[PDB]
Amino acid sequence: NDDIDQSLIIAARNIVRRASVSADPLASLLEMCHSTQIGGTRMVDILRQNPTEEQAVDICKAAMGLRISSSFSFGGFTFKRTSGSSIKREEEVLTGNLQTLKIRVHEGYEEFTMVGKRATAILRKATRRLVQLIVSGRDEQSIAEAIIVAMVFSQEDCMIKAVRGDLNFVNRANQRLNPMHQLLRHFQKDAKVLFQNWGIEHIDNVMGMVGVLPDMTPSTEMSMRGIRVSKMGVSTERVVVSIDRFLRVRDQRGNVLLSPEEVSETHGTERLTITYSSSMMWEINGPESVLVNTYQWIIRNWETVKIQWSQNPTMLYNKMEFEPFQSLVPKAIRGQYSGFVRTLFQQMRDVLGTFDTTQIIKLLPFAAAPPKQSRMQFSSLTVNVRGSGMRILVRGNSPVFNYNKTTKRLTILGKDAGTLIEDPDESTSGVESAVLRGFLILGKEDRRYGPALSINELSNLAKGEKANVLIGQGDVVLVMKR
Numbered sequence: 089n090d091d092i093d094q095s096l097i098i099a100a101r102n103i104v105r106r107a108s109v110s111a112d113p114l115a116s117l118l119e120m121c122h123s124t125q126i127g128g129t130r131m132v133d134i135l136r137q138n139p140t141e142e143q144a145v146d147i148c149k150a151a152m153g154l155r156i157s158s159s160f161s162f163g164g165f166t167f168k169r170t171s172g173s174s175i176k177r178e179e180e181v182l183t184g185n186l187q188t189l190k191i192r193v194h195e196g197y198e199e200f201t202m203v204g205k206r207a208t209a210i211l212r213k214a215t216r217r218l219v220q221l222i223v224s225g226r227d228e229q230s231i232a233e234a235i236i237v238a239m240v241f242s243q244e245d246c247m248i249k250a251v252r253g254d255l256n257f258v259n260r261a262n263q264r265l266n267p268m269h270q271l272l273r274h275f276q277k278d279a280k281v282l283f284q285n286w287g288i289e290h291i292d293n294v295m296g297m298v299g300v301l302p303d304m305t306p307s308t309e310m311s312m313r314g315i316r317v318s319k320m321g322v323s324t325e326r327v328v329v330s331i332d333r334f335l336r337v338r339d340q341r342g343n344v345l346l347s348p349e350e351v352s353e354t355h356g357t358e359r360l361t362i363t364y365s366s367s368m369m370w371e372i373n374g375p376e377s378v379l380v381n382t383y384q385w386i387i388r389n390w391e392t393v394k395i396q397w398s399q400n401p402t403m404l405y406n407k408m409e410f411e412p413f414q415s416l417v418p419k420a421i422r423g424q425y426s427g428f429v430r431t432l433f434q435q436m437r438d439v440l441g442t443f444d445t446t447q448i449i450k451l452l453p454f455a456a457a458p459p460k461q462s463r464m465q466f467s468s469l470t471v472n473v474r475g476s477g478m479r480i481l482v483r484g485n486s487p488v489f490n491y492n493k494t495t496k497r498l499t500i501l502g503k504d505a506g507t508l509i510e511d512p513d514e515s516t517s518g519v520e521s522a523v524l525r526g527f528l529i530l531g532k533e534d535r536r537y538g539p540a541l542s543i544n545e546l547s548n549l550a551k552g553e554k555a556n557v558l559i560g561q562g563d564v565v566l567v568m569k570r
């Protein structure tokens with residue numbers, strides 16, 4: 089039952105990481121935790137009774153209104169205050185790149201332990217001043233990680249002055265990181281200016297403790313100011329917290345104890361099966377599994393989908409289940425697809441007797457994104473699966489979308505998305521109301537209305553005239569305007 093904690097952590101990290109790029113991360117996070125199982129058992133039942141303290145596991149607990157440890161995480165280190173106190177106060181600072189940052193400065197004298205995977209440390213600090221850091225670690229990278237984190241955490245001015253270049257770090261949701269994570273990211277990328285301008289001191293002789301120079305060389309004579317490396321150098325109060333929309337967890341006094349930027353990037357492999365049900369975890373098996381599941385999901389929920397489509401489309405379009413598919417749509421074009429498809433849907437609602445089940449299913453995931461309006465008459469819509477742009481044809485079949493009108497079996501890149509059931513609202517006349525934006529196809533080629541136009545000269549017609557248009561290769565049909 090150590091194997092549960094191990095697998096609960098793997099599952100919580102995945103879920104938080106997925107949640108934070110979603111539209112509503114707190115909503116997505118709870119949805120996925122109620123969705124998931126760890127070896128037969130509901131995740132949310134393991135979270136209510138398992139005492140494991142880890143960054144992602146605690147974000148989840150916070151989301152379920154549970155109580156978690158008051159320690160906080162910064163740069164992957166768990167800080168536990170061992171003595172002292174501090175007050176918050178807001179300050180503006182000028183970096184070494186003459187950028188202006190508004191920082192939440194802490195004033196007071198404080199002692200902390202910092203605990204990490206590959207190094208731990210004891211830290212003493214005061215207002216904008218590091219007083220002492222004793223760090224022990226597996227190798228020079230680990231020690232250095234700890235030292236960088238303590239240096240940014242001290243908030244000292246020479247750290248601020250050590251910035252080069254501008255700080256514009258964002259997360260995957262393109263949201264700016266708060267300034268302390270701005271500075272920490274900048275120095276995690278390269279720390280030599282920071283180490284060289286920090287300052288050097290002669291050191292006293294103490295058993296089991298050595299100095300460290302700006303190039304991570306050990307020294308029995310000198311050391312970076314206030315820093316020592318030790319050899320043997322090396323948690324139970326739980327409090328009520330608040331979790332806001334973007335999963336930043338706070339304590340009563342408004343300190344951010346945990347956020348998604350504090351989740352470890354390590355990706356281990358479970359020793360118990362983890363089973364995600366959420367649509368959010370479809371992408372686990374590649375964009376192909378996204379597409380199949382999207383269309384599969386629509387078939388299985390057809391009865392609720394068909395009536396929300398018919399009377400409350402706003403809530404249909406905004407559903408959580410359509411976010412994964414939306415990733416696969418080029419961000420440049422997705423809004424104009426959405427605006428194209430929503431109009432075609434509205435034509436099918438307004439012009440009655442022309443309900444097409446296969447067509448609604450095909451285009452429905454494209455209406456998720458915000459409707460930007462265009463006038464291009466898309467003949468196909470594109471989704472990128474592993475870097476290549478596959479196309480769904482607005483009219484007819486396709487490797488991506490292949491429906492079989494007799495067997496009624498829908499196929500998605502090969503795999504069987506299901507089978508459609510007989511629906512009386514299905515139109516029997518050949519009128520297609522959801523292929524051409526602003527136009528209605530009325531069946532086969534009829535020569536008495538003229539010879540075949542092409543699609544770019546449909547604009548030269550106005551207020552519902554009746555023309556034949558070359559829709560494909562050889563395929564000619566009769567199309568009227570609204």
Ligand SMILES: O=C(O)[C@H]1[C@H]2CC[C@H](CC2)[C@@H]1Nc1nc(-c2c[nH]c3ncc(F)cc23)ncc1F
Nearest residue numbers: 160161162174192194198241268342343344345
């Ligand atoms: O801004 C916050 O509230 C966060 C972000 C910036 C550093 C910590 C981790 C992320 C900080 N969280 C917390 N800081 C502190 C905190 C105490 N003394 C400090 N001196 C400098 C500092 F910088 C933060 C602190 N206490 C509890 C926290 F929970």
